[PDB]
Structures are given as C-alpha cells and as structure tokens.
Amino acid sequence: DAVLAHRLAEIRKALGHARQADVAALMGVSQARVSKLESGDLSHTELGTLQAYVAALGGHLRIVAEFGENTVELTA
Amino acid sequence: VLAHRLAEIRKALGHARQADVAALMGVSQARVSKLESGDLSHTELGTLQAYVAALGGHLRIVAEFGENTVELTALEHH
C-alpha cells in the first residue's frame, strides 16, 4: 500500500531513516541545494533531479502512463 | 507496455501528430520536438504530465523502495 507524496520531502520522510543531510551527501550536492529542491513544487521538479533524489534514497522510479485500462512504462 | 521514446507512445496510442499535441499543450512544436527527441533529464514533471494528458492518458510516478512504495501526486502544473 503506497503512501502518497505531494511534496519531494514527503518521499524522504516516508522512509524515515534518511535525513536531509544524508540525501544531499548521497546525491553529491550541498544540503542547501536539497533544501531548495524540497521547498519547491513537485510539478516544477526536473525528472533527472527526481531520479537522483530517489536513487539516493535507495529506490528507483517507475514512470507509468495509463491509457484506458492499459498502462505503458516510460524507459527514458 | 514499454517505451524508450515519448514518440513511440504517441504513435501507438492514437493518431495525434506533433502539432496536434503542441496545440493541446499550448506549447511550441519545437518544445514537443525536443520532448520526443532530446533527453528528458531537464524536463519538469508537470511538462511530462501535460504531454501524457494531451495524448488522452494519465501520468503516474511511483518511487519504488522494495517492500515500500511512494506514489507522487500533484504532478500537474498550475
């Protein structure tokens, strides 16, 4: 049962153990950069940035588009 | 069910051409062209949302963490 995230930081908080500093260091950016990212709109977040953020958290992105009762997976 | 390219998706799921999608999104055909050709690393989530929506579909993004899963909402611009 998936938890819902309306904000980038809610993805991290769902895991519990990964602090903001942890994700920054794993992404290889300053914590100031991650604080900036987490204060923004999810809709204006770049896909590459989202990918790196989720990867730093130990996960991977599934990008799906539902068409009718079918679903296509985007591999980009 | 798998697609390396946005264009692949468009062409299999109907008959919309690039100018059709551009009009639906209210963006340049250039932008749509770069979407389907270029690398999506610097593409905003809301832009991808709008593209899939113009094709008549619904974008879902899921962060998969093994036994746990986080689904993103509010992917739409406004």
Curated annotation (Swiss-Prot), chain A:
Q: Which UniProt keywords apply?
A: DNA-binding, Toxin-antitoxin system, Transcription, Transcription regulation
- Cite a single GO MF annotation: DNA binding
Question: Which regions of the protein are recorded as binding DNA?
Answer: 20-39
- The answer on whether this UniProt entry bears the keyword Transcription regulation reads yes
Q: Does the keyword Ribonucleoprotein apply?
A: no
Domain spans labelled HTH cro/C1-type: 8-64
Q: What does the UniProt record say this protein does?
A: Putative antitoxin component of a type II toxin-antitoxin (TA) system. Its cognate toxin would be HigB3.
Q: What is this protein called?
A: Putative antitoxin HigA3
